């Protein structure tokens, strides 16, 4: 029946592989960085971790997954493997905004700007007011290199998370738990990735104008 989470798996494949697994009082964080592709690592590491903590997937109370913004190939691998994990048992899914996760993974507080380079001369980016929780000063969108500078002045660049983004797996687990407690979880067949990719079609279809 209805109880509070004990066993929580969350990963984010939006850049580097980030896996968090809480089991009771025990939280394990694992990250991988190297030449190997996500499809070569993520499933093996997930299996080993679960095995070592004497945990089966059906014993999971929620699974968190990063939904972007991030690298298409990475996101696809992560989300797809999660679908494979939960689909047999309809285990609830916490959709995690990779940029928010990035912001929350920063020790400090205040005003934070997160950016990832797209195609030459463009950048994904968002700005966040971060204290107790975290509040969006501008939602993740695509901008040019010039338009990025507009944002760095228009808001306070107190912390600037650019290009190489640290994600704390602990934060993934914590956010997954939060969404679960707020009844904001979803089914595995309801996942809607943040594809900002799609915005460059319209913004570069003309020139430097959109209104």
């Amino acid at each position: 029946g209805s109880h509070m989470a004990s066993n929580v798996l969350a990963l984010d494949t939006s850049q580097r592989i980030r896996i968090g697994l809480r089991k009771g009082e025990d939280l394990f964080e694992i990250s991988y960085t190297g030449e190997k592709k996500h499809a070569e690592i993520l499933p093996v590491v997930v299996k080993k971790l679960l095995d070592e903590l004497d945990l089966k997937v059906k014993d999971l109370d929620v699974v968190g997954v990063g939904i972007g913004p991030g690298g298409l190939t990475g996101l696809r691998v992560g989300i797809a493997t999660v679908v494979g994990l939960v689909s047999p048992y309809d285990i609830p899914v916490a959709p995690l905004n990779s940029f928010e996760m990035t912001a929350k993974s920063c020790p400090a507080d205040g005003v934070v700007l997160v950016a990832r380079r797209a195609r030459k001369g463009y950048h994904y980016c968002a700005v966040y007011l971060k204290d107790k929780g975290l509040n969006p000063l501008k939602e993740p969108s695509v901008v040019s290199d010039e338009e990025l500078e507009e944002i760095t002045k228009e808001f306070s660049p107190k912390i600037v998370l650019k290009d190489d983004l640290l994600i704390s797996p602990a934060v993934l687990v914590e956010e997954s738990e939060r969404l679960f407690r707020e009844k904001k979880t979803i089914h595995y067949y309801e996942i809607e990735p943040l594809y900002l990719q799609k915005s460059i079609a319209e913004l570069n279809w003309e020139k430097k104008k959109r209104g």
């Binding site: 499809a39 499933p43 696809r76 493997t81 679908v83 494979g84 689909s87």
Partner: protein, 330 residues
């Protein structure tokens, strides 16, 4: 009952597909997004599907699958891992490894074109290799050998355009529309196949490979050179050229390998003129020939599940580290 139930996944190109298969014979579920689309589906209280949207489609099909098939009954999970689009392959592959971990079942990576060939053995349970297979769809144009143990080699492939691709593009030239294969087949019926020749730099006699690019342009050249031809005659004459290439090589291979059984799979294998030419030569030189049904020849997860069942029987399982290979070679 030592029953082996295999759930197959296929996301190599345009089609998203999930199937469940028992003992390489009994079909339990055989879903394709094509069916879910090509049949109406007014709204829903479960999201909708669209072509080549693998990440959001596959979940849907899995939901459907598990409604008919209780998950714990699945013994083996099988998925295509190449060749094809890395971005697409990865979704099927990754979900399948997901399920293996979840169900604590073993996992099998399947080669897409090898899978296509299983359509022959699904459709002819009594059929024993060796045989030769002409695989000849829109994507694939390949000549393959299957030996006693069910190993496969590719002994010929296209060096440019597939056969289906030749039909599609030439049909555009003749202003017949899409898909090209069917319309040309229909229109050719009432045409003279001996009317025109299509000369071009043809590749080696001994080679078991194909080239159609030059036949495509040869027809273009013709249209902008000649006067007062009839579509029927051009379609018929082009159609003759294509099947003549395909049949000569396929039978020549089989002869030289000393094989007496030949199978034809894929869209182009439907062609009425090809089938006639094939039966003529089959009769004359005393060959068995096999033309699987059409819903097996198009991309689907059943051929994957079959391919998976056969590898699993032989204990040829895949590790969880298996990466998608867009250039996978059989």
């Amino acid at each position: 009952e030592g029953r082996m139930r295999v759930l197959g996944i296929e996301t190599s190109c345009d089609e998203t597909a999930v199937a469940v298969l028992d003992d390489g014979k009994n079909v339990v579920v055989n879903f394709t997004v094509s069916q879910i689309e090509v049949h109406q589906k007014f709204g829903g209280v479960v999201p909708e599907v669209a072509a080549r949207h693998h990440l959001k489609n596959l979940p849907i099909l899995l939901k459907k699958a598990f409604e008919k098939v209780p998950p714990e009954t699945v013994d083996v999970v099988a998925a295509t891992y190449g060749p094809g689009l890395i971005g697409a392959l990865l979704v099927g592959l990754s979900a399948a490894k997901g399920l293996a971990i979840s169900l604590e079942k073993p996992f099998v990576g399947v080669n897409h074109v090898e899978a296509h060939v299983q359509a022959v053995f699904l459709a002819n349970p009594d059929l024993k290799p060796p045989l030769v297979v002409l695989m000849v769809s829109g994507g694939h144009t390949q000549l393959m050998k299957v030996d006693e143990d069910y190993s496969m080699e590719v002994l010929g492939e296209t060096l440019d355009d597939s056969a289906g691709e030749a039909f599609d593009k030439v049909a555009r030239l003749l202003g017949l529309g899409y898909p090209g294969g069917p319309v040309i087949d229909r229109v050719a019926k009432k045409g003279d196949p001996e009317k025109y020749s299509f000369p071009r730099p043809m590749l080696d006699d001994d080679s078991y490979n194909f080239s159609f690019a030059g036949l495509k342009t040869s027809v273009l050249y013709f249209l902008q050179r000649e006067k007062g031809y009839k579509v029927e005659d051009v379609a018929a004459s082009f159609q003759k050229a294509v099947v003549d290439i395909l049949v000569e090589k396929t039978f020549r291979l089989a002869r030289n390998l000393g094989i007496r059984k030949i199978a034809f799979v894929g869209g182009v294998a439907a062609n009425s003129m090809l089938r006639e030419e094939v039966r003529k030569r089959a009769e004359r030189w005393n060959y068995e020939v096999f033309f699987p049904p059409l819903e097996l020849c198009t991309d689907n997860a059943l051929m994957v599940a079959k391919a998976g069942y056969e590898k699993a029987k032989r204990g040829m399982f895949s590790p969880l580290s298996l990466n998608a290979d867009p250039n996978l070679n059989v």
